[PDB]
């Protein structure tokens with residue numbers, strides 16, 4: 001409780017024992033609020049059922065809280081300087097494995113196979129480094145990993161885009177990408193005062209529950225995502241305009257794109273940002289057949 005890593009004094013004591021200096025280049029902002037940490041663990045429903053992938057353990061503030069509930073925790077940490085610290089701070093916990101490696105170069109599926117054979121369910125729970133929040137989430141989702149869900153702390157503005165409702169000004173290609181694979185919900189907003197050092201931007205905790213199969217039925221995922229990106233490329237322009245200018249087929253096959261919009265009952269004159277994920281799926285299947 002009060003003796004845990006994540007108290008302001010305890011955190012400082014550790015950092016001082018090792019003379020640790022933060023690297024803003026690695027998004028190092030450590031949690032020093034045990035109620036926040038416990039809250040995150042609650043939102044991830046971590047029990048003895050659960051094997052947990054943690055990204056960016058730091059000096060172990062969240063790791064410790066996860067370790068008390070989970071069957072097993074594996075934590076990827078990029079900073080070699082933290083490794084001896086974690087060995088010390090997490091010495092009371094025998095269910096923790098730290099792997100020294102940038103999560104973006106890891107083969108997470110192999111790690112899951114090797115480490116979590118005895119777990120009923122796998123969660124990702126993490127206070128993410130803000131400089132690569134979106135790459136990390138995209139990697140985890142793109143690779144169809146056998147996860148129940150992902151609960152992470154990240155920039156507020158990023159959570160808001162991930163979880164965006166279609167009426168939200170934050171609705172975008174990122175909303176669609178996340179919501180294709182998951183049900184997304186921003187569950188907490190956290191002040192800057194619960195970290196050391198305090199971050200420059202606001203923070204939030206988002207909860208992503210992996211869907212049993214994709215949200216919509218599309219012929220071709222690759223094509224679907226490129227279409228999404230082309231459609232949102234300029235906020236104020238028509239969907240047609242965006243497609244002509246952003247699909248490489250756009251300026252070669254414009255008439256075919258106009259025919260498909262007509263055939264799928266989607267007014268080109270609407271903005272791309274008006275389209276729901278279902279309309280995007282319909283448009284994508286129609287275009288994929290025509291385009292190819």
Ligand SMILES: C[S@@+](CC[C@H](N)C(=O)[O-])C[C@H]1O[C@@H](n2cnc3c(N)ncnc32)[C@H](O)[C@@H]1O
Pocket residue numbers: 026027028029030031032055056057058059060061062063076077078079101102103104126127128129130132
């Ligand atoms: C925001 S801090 C959070 C630390 C700790 N989880 C906490 O809440 O106190 C981010 C952590 O991610 C680590 N990190 C940064 N980039 C990384 C990457 N690509 N892969 C794995 N860890 C990374 C940092 O070294 C740092 O420990």
